[PDB]
Ligand binder design. Structure first.
Ligand SMILES: Nc1nccc(-c2c(-c3ccc(F)cc3)ncn2C2CCNCC2)n1
Ligand SMILES: N[C@@]12C[C@H]3C[C@@H](C1)C[C@](O)(C3)C2
Ligand SMILES: N[C@@]12C[C@H]3C[C@@H](C1)C[C@](O)(C3)C2
Ligand SMILES: N[C@@]12C[C@H]3C[C@@H](C1)C[C@](O)(C3)C2
Ligand SMILES: [Ca+2]
Ligand SMILES: [Ca+2]
Ligand SMILES: [Ca+2]
Ligand SMILES: [Cl-]
Ligand SMILES: [Cl-]
Length: 345
């Protein structure tokens, strides 16, 4: 294929002639993204150029990690790969990686910002997040930083999770307490806490826990969910942190019906099951999909799990050129999916 060069975001992109009319649509994880027209299919795509993919073993392994993950993801609510390309003609020339997916014009902040959503629409948005999470969680992949800006949405409110599983000042308002505060154990339900925070904000138009720092955010959380038991302290390494929490004036759990006034009582019930401090008592994604709040959308035949995903590489320290060669292998072996991968139920 013939490549062409274009300066985008102050740097040269080199892309196959297949992709035309590139226009910047923002940064992504370790890279920047342009929308483009795929002349082969007439589809609109998003092309991510990785920034310095092989600068160090940290960059090189994260490049491999991202390509492996995206090659594995085949779910309608999860970002996956239409194409992956490099201008390099051989491994010796290989220093640039571009990833291609379907174009999603907005993030979730674009959906709720200027639109009072209906409850039926909120149901659909949260349902899609949970379906995507069921899939990634089934492959032992956790997001860990799920938030509105990591949910890509198209013109018809179809949503995909991105930037999951990936060892600048980010918002912490949606992070699970066990992540934000570096507690000693956590599971896949870290992402369910984030869903609760997202859903609360879609229903009320207000950030649920807009803390100015980690301590202020914890205080806002405890005012809603109540002071934790001694059992929860088991998970916290720092004595100063445990002593502080234990020292706080005790607060009762709020009745969520008094917090989310006017909301669908089924929404309030689901929120009560998601926004619990004990990650072992938090509802899972698969359980949440069965909740009556989503009754009009739920379809067990269309909520699939993932194929087994081999993450053995995560425990390995390899040399930079080994990660580079493995990444090159994954670029070369990529098989684009069929354009139409779905059939009427
Ligand atoms: N517009 C759009 N559409 C789809 C995805 C993205 C995208 C990607 C990305 C990931 C993999 C890939 F192969 C191609 C692109 N990474 C971050 N973003 C974001 C860019 C702006 N914030 C929301 C989406 N952006
Ligand atoms: N520059 C564009 C803007 C829109 C998305 C993508 C990139 C395809 C296009 O045809 C419409 C051109
Ligand atoms: N339902 C959709 C939403 C976006 C615009 C248009 C209609 C084409 C599509 O592929 C992306 C599907
Ligand atoms: N966003 C808030 C933060 C605190 C807990 C809960 C949710 C009730 C509230 O009045 C205080 C607003
Ligand atoms: Ca269906
Ligand atoms: Ca069916
Ligand atoms: Ca079809
Ligand atoms: Cl695998
Ligand atoms: Cl592996």
């Amino acid at each position: 294929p013939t490549f062409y060069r274009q300066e985008l975001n102050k740097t040269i992109w080199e892309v196959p002639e297949r992709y035309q009319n590139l226009s910047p649509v923002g940064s992504g994880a370790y890279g920047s993204v342009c929308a483009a027209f795929d002349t082969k299919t007439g589809h609109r795509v998003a092309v991510k150029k990785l920034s310095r993919p092989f600068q160090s073993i940290i960059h090189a392994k994260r490049t491999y990690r991202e390509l492996r993950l995206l090659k594995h993801m085949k779910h309608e609510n999860v970002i996956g790969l239409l194409d992956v390309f490099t201008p390099a003609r051989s491994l010796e020339e290989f220093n640039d990686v571009y990833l291609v997916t379907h174009l999603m014009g907005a993030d979730l902040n674009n959906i709720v910002k200027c639109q009072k959503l209906t409850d039926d629409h909120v149901q659909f948005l949260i349902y899609q997040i949970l379906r995507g999470l069921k899939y990634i969680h089934s492959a032992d992949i956790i997001h860990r930083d799920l938030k509105p800006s990591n949910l890509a949405v198209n013109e018809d409110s179809e949503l995909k999770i991105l930037d999951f599983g990936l060892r600048y000042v980010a918002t912490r308002w949606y992070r699970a307490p066990e992540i934000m505060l570096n507690w000693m154990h956590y599971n896949q339900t870290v992402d369910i806490w984030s869903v609760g925070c997202i859903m609360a904000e879609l229903l009320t138009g207000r950030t649920l826990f807009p803390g100015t720092d980690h301590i202020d955010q914890l205080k806002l959380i405890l005012r809603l969910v109540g002071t934790p038991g001694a059992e929860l302290l088991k998970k916290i390494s720092s004595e100063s942190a445990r002593n502080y929490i234990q020292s706080l004036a005790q607060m009762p759990k709020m009745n969520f019906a008094n917090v989310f006034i006017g909301a669908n009582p089924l929404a309030v019930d689901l929120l009560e099951k998601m926004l619990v401090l004990d990650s072992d008592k938090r509802i899972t994604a698969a359980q949440a999909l069965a909740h009556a709040y989503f009754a009009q959308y739920h379809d067990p035949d269309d909520e699939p799990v993932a194929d087994p995903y081999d993450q053995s590489f995560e425990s390995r320290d390899l040399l930079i050129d080994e990660w580079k060669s493995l990444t090159y292998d994954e670029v070369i072996s990529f098989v684009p999916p069929p354009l139409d991968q779905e059939e009427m139920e």
